[PDB]
Design a protein around this motif. Structure first.
Motif, mmCIF file in Angstrom:
data_model
loop_
_atom_site.group_PDB
_atom_site.id
_atom_site.type_symbol
_atom_site.label_atom_id
_atom_site.label_comp_id
_atom_site.label_asym_id
_atom_site.label_seq_id
_atom_site.Cartn_x
_atom_site.Cartn_y
_atom_site.Cartn_z
ATOM 1 N N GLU A 52 0.827 -1.204 0.000
ATOM 2 C CA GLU A 52 0.000 0.000 0.000
ATOM 3 C C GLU A 52 0.861 1.254 0.000
ATOM 4 O O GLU A 52 0.506 2.257 -0.630
ATOM 5 C CB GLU A 52 -0.961 -0.015 1.184
ATOM 6 C CG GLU A 52 -1.833 -1.268 1.221
ATOM 7 C CD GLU A 52 -3.221 -1.077 0.618
ATOM 8 O OE1 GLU A 52 -3.369 -0.285 -0.336
ATOM 9 O OE2 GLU A 52 -4.164 -1.760 1.078
ATOM 10 N N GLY A 53 1.989 1.227 0.717
ATOM 11 C CA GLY A 53 2.910 2.354 0.659
ATOM 12 C C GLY A 53 3.492 2.554 -0.729
ATOM 13 O O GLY A 53 3.703 3.687 -1.165
ATOM 14 N N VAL A 54 3.784 1.453 -1.437
ATOM 15 C CA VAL A 54 4.295 1.574 -2.800
ATOM 16 C C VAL A 54 3.285 2.295 -3.682
ATOM 17 O O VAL A 54 3.652 3.143 -4.502
ATOM 18 C CB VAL A 54 4.655 0.185 -3.370
ATOM 19 C CG1 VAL A 54 5.037 0.305 -4.824
ATOM 20 C CG2 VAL A 54 5.802 -0.448 -2.574
ATOM 21 N N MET A 56 1.009 4.412 -2.675
ATOM 22 C CA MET A 56 0.968 5.802 -2.231
ATOM 23 C C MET A 56 2.061 6.646 -2.895
ATOM 24 O O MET A 56 1.789 7.746 -3.402
ATOM 25 C CB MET A 56 1.090 5.836 -0.713
ATOM 26 C CG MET A 56 -0.183 5.488 0.014
ATOM 27 S SD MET A 56 0.092 5.567 1.791
ATOM 28 C CE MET A 56 0.165 3.843 2.209
ATOM 29 N N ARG B 227 1.348 13.409 4.766
ATOM 30 C CA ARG B 227 1.529 12.309 3.829
ATOM 31 C C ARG B 227 2.844 11.564 4.063
ATOM 32 O O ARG B 227 2.907 10.338 3.910
ATOM 33 C CB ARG B 227 1.448 12.848 2.406
ATOM 34 C CG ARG B 227 1.616 11.765 1.369
ATOM 35 C CD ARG B 227 0.509 10.744 1.406
ATOM 36 N NE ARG B 227 0.459 10.051 0.126
ATOM 37 C CZ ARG B 227 -0.540 9.276 -0.276
ATOM 38 N NH1 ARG B 227 -1.587 9.082 0.504
ATOM 39 N NH2 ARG B 227 -0.486 8.704 -1.468
ATOM 40 N N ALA B 230 2.490 9.014 6.729
ATOM 41 C CA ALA B 230 1.691 7.865 6.306
ATOM 42 C C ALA B 230 2.533 6.851 5.547
ATOM 43 O O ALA B 230 2.370 5.638 5.730
ATOM 44 C CB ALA B 230 0.521 8.328 5.446
ATOM 45 N N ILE B 231 3.411 7.323 4.661
ATOM 46 C CA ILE B 231 4.266 6.407 3.913
ATOM 47 C C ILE B 231 5.236 5.684 4.840
ATOM 48 O O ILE B 231 5.488 4.485 4.677
ATOM 49 C CB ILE B 231 4.976 7.156 2.773
ATOM 50 C CG1 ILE B 231 3.933 7.581 1.737
ATOM 51 C CG2 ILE B 231 6.059 6.284 2.146
ATOM 52 C CD1 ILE B 231 4.469 8.422 0.663
ATOM 53 N N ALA B 234 3.436 2.871 6.575
ATOM 54 C CA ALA B 234 3.127 1.735 5.711
ATOM 55 C C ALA B 234 4.377 0.961 5.278
ATOM 56 O O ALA B 234 4.367 -0.276 5.273
ATOM 57 C CB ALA B 234 2.349 2.223 4.492
ATOM 58 N N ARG B 235 5.448 1.656 4.882
ATOM 59 C CA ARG B 235 6.628 1.005 4.319
ATOM 60 C C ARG B 235 7.753 0.771 5.317
ATOM 61 O O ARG B 235 8.583 -0.115 5.086
ATOM 62 C CB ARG B 235 7.204 1.837 3.169
ATOM 63 C CG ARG B 235 6.251 2.078 2.024
ATOM 64 C CD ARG B 235 6.987 2.635 0.813
ATOM 65 N NE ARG B 235 7.788 1.624 0.134
ATOM 66 C CZ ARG B 235 8.242 1.759 -1.105
ATOM 67 N NH1 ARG B 235 8.116 2.927 -1.727
ATOM 68 N NH2 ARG B 235 8.942 0.780 -1.665
#
Lengths: 326, 326
Positions: A52-54, A56, B227, B230-231, B234-235
């Motif tokens: 999901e980060g990819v 984003m 933002r 958020a990344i 996630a990553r």
């Protein structure tokens, strides 16, 4: 002015190679500035939160050509309607994993992906294998995709090829575009044969270091074979960015053509007497639209035949290890 | 057919942003397919062994346009003959450092680099600051480079800008090319003001969520500001690939132009009444060849004026903290 969209499936989409690859698909570089693309991103189940980060970051590229990003851990869903496939995901060789077990574990993965490709992808799909053992992985994929023409499944030796050009350019002191008629024969491995036998440097018809068989044997060939290890020693990580770069070039030339010789690991139809049924890197000309042809008419001298045979030996051996899964 | 070469200096050249940036310079994307490039790569002294790995990977890209790769840990050597400089390197917050120390320590870095730029780079050099605090770093660079026109040194808000574009496209369900007249005002920080006041979407003339000031205030603006966090969530790593993408886009538009509004943090000449002497992001049109102009005539409502004022306030506070490096 924009063509209808094409669909690209990329496995291992959370990895470092994907991290460089995907932006250079979405930017229009791989397939052309007027070719909209849809990305189907495949990862392992436990990596779905990271994937999901990819998505984003790719959305945050604000790319006009990127019409869709689809995420999945299902290979059947991943390959639905795929026009192109770049297979980065596989099982890497870890410490104390036997060579045969790595080959067989990857065979099961590429058996499953070949089956899914056959069921779900479009009829003219072109498949590029990057994950190691590439040549064998490509062969296993094709064996399990009876409705895909074997030539539409290739393995990447393009990084070896480009590393060879870089060695020549550094040694000779020329531009990359001055080099013509270079090729990698064999396995994407340390037994590869980087072949200078037919290579030309623009304007240079006389004394030139690429004719020096002592330099070829003692420096050029080993430097190309061990280039991956040298980068690891300098950076502490493998060469993800140049591998993604080689993937981009391989697909771009496959789709749009390249007037120069390029290397691709392709299904052997016995060209130059190479044993049939293995995937083997050869000099090819990419005419585009997925069509390529082995360079014809080359006299193979005994130094070359010896080197090619050493790599063919390893590819045959790899095939026997996975031969019960074909 | 090929232009004469230009020289680009990149600091922090071993970092994650650089790993994506340099290949999208060497491929001709940043400056055009007919513009040969020379890279002068700068790193800290202790990273020079790894920087050799960067050169190796770039050479292995076999880029026809990459005429030279020069490596150094000396700012004086790095900027010699620079036509372009992309400043990724800086000092992250570490032990003993408060927010003020982060500003002052980085100001000391960019005072030194502005001094080197003024002395060593070519007269028309364009300088892009990526390292945080971007606006303030750019201001310090310019203050210590009296012979460089202040407009030739900018700070990057293009990633904030592109993140806003992606939020609109995801929420509304349109293509990126459907969106027009978007801009980021203020500091490259959480006080930035992503401004939808003038934005249009091709074909959508009636009910549309980007008119809804509550969605703007409660979701859009905070999602754009946060933002990056958020990344990371996630990553597990920061968004290096999209920051490199924004830098490519920022430089590309600066040099070759772009018909759409883009955001750049630029020296304030009092546009929209903004205090002078700070670098502040504004809607600009890049005409190419290094020339840009703030979009004129925009009516600024009270909600917009409040938000812009909040970010100006932060920029002024940042300037007072580093004032001794002027």
């Amino acid at each position: 002015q924009l063509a209808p969209p094409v669909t690209i499936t990329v496995s291992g989409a959370c990895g470092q190679i994907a991290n460089s690859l995907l932006f250079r698909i979405a930017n229009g570089e791989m397939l052309g500035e007027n070719q909209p693309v849809k990305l189907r991103l495949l990862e392992r189940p436990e990596a779905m939160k990271a994937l999901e980060g990819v998505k984003m970051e790719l959305d945050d590229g604000a790319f006009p050509l990127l019409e869709e990003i689809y995420l999945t851990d299902s290979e059947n869903d991943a390959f639905r309607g795929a026009d192109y496939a770049i297979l980065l995901g596989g099982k890497p060789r870890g410490p104390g994993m036997e060579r045969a077990d790595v080959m067989k574990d990857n065979a099961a993965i590429f058996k499953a992906q070949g089956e899914a490709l056959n069921k779900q992808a479009n009829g003219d799909v072109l498949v590029l294998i990057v994950a190691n053992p590439a040549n064998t992985n490509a062969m296993i994929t094709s064996a399990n995709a009876p409705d895909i023409p074997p030539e539409n499944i290739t393995a990447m030796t393009r990084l070896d090829h480009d590393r060879g050009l870089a060695q020549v350019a550094a040694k000779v002191g020329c531009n990359i575009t001055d080099i013509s008629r270079f090729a990698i024969w064999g396995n994407h491995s340390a037994t590869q044969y980087p072949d200078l036998s037919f290579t030309t440097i623009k304007g240079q018809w006389g004394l030139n270091v690429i004719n020096d068989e002592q330099w070829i044997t003692n420096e050029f060939i080993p430097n190309v074979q061990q280039r991956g290890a040298a980068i690891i020693k300098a950076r502490g990580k493998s060469s993800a960015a140049s591998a993604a770069d080689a993937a981009i070039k391989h697909m771009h030339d496959w789709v749009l053509g390249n007037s120069e010789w390029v290397s691709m690991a392709i299904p052997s139809r016995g060209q130059y007497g190479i044993p049939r049924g293995i995937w083997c890197s050869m000099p090819v000309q990419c005419f585009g639209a997925g069509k390529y042809g082995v360079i014809e008419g080359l006299p193979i001298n005994s130094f070359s035949a010896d080197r090619i045979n050493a790599s063919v030996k390893e590819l045959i051996e790899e095939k026997k290890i996975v031969e019960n899964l074909l």
